[PDB]
Amino acid sequence: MEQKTLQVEGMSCQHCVKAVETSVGELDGVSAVHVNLEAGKVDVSFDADKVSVKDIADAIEDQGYDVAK
Amino acid sequence: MEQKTLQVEGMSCQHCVKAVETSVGELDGVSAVHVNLEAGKVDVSFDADKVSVKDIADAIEDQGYDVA
Ligand SMILES: [Ca+2]
Ligand SMILES: [Cu+]
Ligand SMILES: [Cu+]
Ligand SMILES: [Cu+]
Ligand SMILES: [Cu+]
């Protein structure tokens, strides 16, 4: 298993958090996703054989948020 | 038809806008609802015999926003 924290800009409220958690948690291989809204950190745990960091970042950017470099 | 504008604090994005639009619009007696995020204002047209200003304000507060 891998555990990664992504730095995300543009989330402003708990609806934004729920959009990210729903979109990331629907990727095959993710086991958990939680967000620290104040810090703009998205914590994810996943099976890297089934899903990549980039897949997760692309899901977040598809929801309109920017993922730091 | 009756109308009311409410000043609403706490909305921060288009998800908030939609939450307000949905919860107010779902109230029996509401004819139309417009949210201005930038101005923090909500305009509602409604049948005051079926829904009240307080019902509208309460629906907005139940979504987590303050009503002035
Ligand atoms: Ca009545
Ligand atoms: Cu939001
Ligand atoms: Cu949002
Ligand atoms: Cu929002
Ligand atoms: Cu929101």
Swiss-Prot record, chain A:
Domain of life: Bacteria
Record-annotated membrane-spanning stretches: none
Record bears the keyword Signal: no
Gene Ontology biological process terms in this record: copper ion transport
One Pfam family here: HMA
Cytoplasm is among the record's keywords: yes
Keywords tagged on the record: Chaperone, Copper, Cytoplasm, Metal-binding
Binding-site list for Cu cation: 13, 16
Main location: cytoplasm
Sequence ranges assigned to domain HMA in this UniProt record: 2-68
Induction: By Cu(2+).
PANTHER family registered for this protein in UniProt: P-TYPE CATION-TRANSPORTING ATPASE
Function, in words: Chaperone that serves for the intracellular sequestration and transport of Cu(+). Delivers Cu(+) to the copper-transporting ATPase CopA. Functions in E.coli to transfer Cu(+) to CopA missing its first metal-binding domain.
General remark: The copZA operon is activated by CueR and indirectly repressed by YfmP.
Subunit-structure text: Monomer in the absence of copper. Homodimer in the presence of copper ions. Forms a heterodimer (electrostatic interactions) with CopA during the transfer of Cu(+).
Protein name: Copper chaperone CopZ
Protein encoded by which gene: copZ
